[PDB]
Ligand SMILES: CCCCNC(=O)c1cc(S(N)(=O)=O)c(Cl)cc1SC1CCCCC1
């Protein structure tokens with residue numbers, strides 16, 4: 175099955191998932207000089223006041239913090255989007271070292287990690303239908319750099335010991351994802367894809383310019399997770415990122431400057 179190594183990593187995905195070589199794959203390098211400022215783009219509206227986290231899951235590729243998406247409670251709107259997108263889950267991608275880990279890059283700079291808040295377009299009724307549509311998902315991507323701790327991240331970090339291995343989950347209620355956001359909502363946006371199999375070309379990407387800072391101790395806790403299940407040989411969950419893919423016939427737009 176697919177994963178992050180030499181024989182099952184990103185360079186192999188196209189044999190099971192030929193869209194890997196498609197026209198709107200993610201992530202991409204964000205060449206900041208070439209991105210054009212679009213005065214028609216709106217401020218992003220992030221409305222997370224009523225978010226209901228329920229659980230956290232080690233799915234063997236990353237960990238997902240899941241939300242109750244059965245009512246409009248945590249929604250993304252505005253920005254480049256038409257209509258309303260409901261938060262279903264967030265997860266991260268991170269490196270074995272602080273110098274790598276992000277999926278998107280900014281003028282070829284790789285951040286230590288990248289947070290993905292995944293939302294689906296309510297006009298398609300549920301996530302599984304949304305991923306079959308070119309405007310089905312909106313993913314808010316946020317870079318992480320290592321420096322000062324992110325206090326709003328600590329509840330996540332502290333539960334990771336309980337979900338060390340693939341298939342473990344834990345009650346994870348009352349987590350507020352507002353504590354993972356940077357000060358500015360200035361962003362870049364482009365049409366792309368899921369960055370994991372099945373690599374569906376269903377995502378409007380919204381990548382924030384301002385990274386959040388997390389501490390070395392926080393990211394070290396990410397790197398103690400395992401991609402294996404309990405009772406199997408230990409493979410640290412590190413370097414769970416797909417490299418930048420060809421931009422092809424796409425324009426990256428900036429909400430700023
Ligand atoms: C089997 C799932 C493997 C791990 N991937 C994800 O959790 C995932 C990653 C992204 S990303 N990295 O582009 O933000 C997005 Cl947008 C949606 C999904 S969940 C979804 C994938 C399609 C159908 C299965 C669940």
Ligand SMILES: [Zn+2]
Nearest residue numbers: 265267290369
């Ligand atoms: Zn992701």
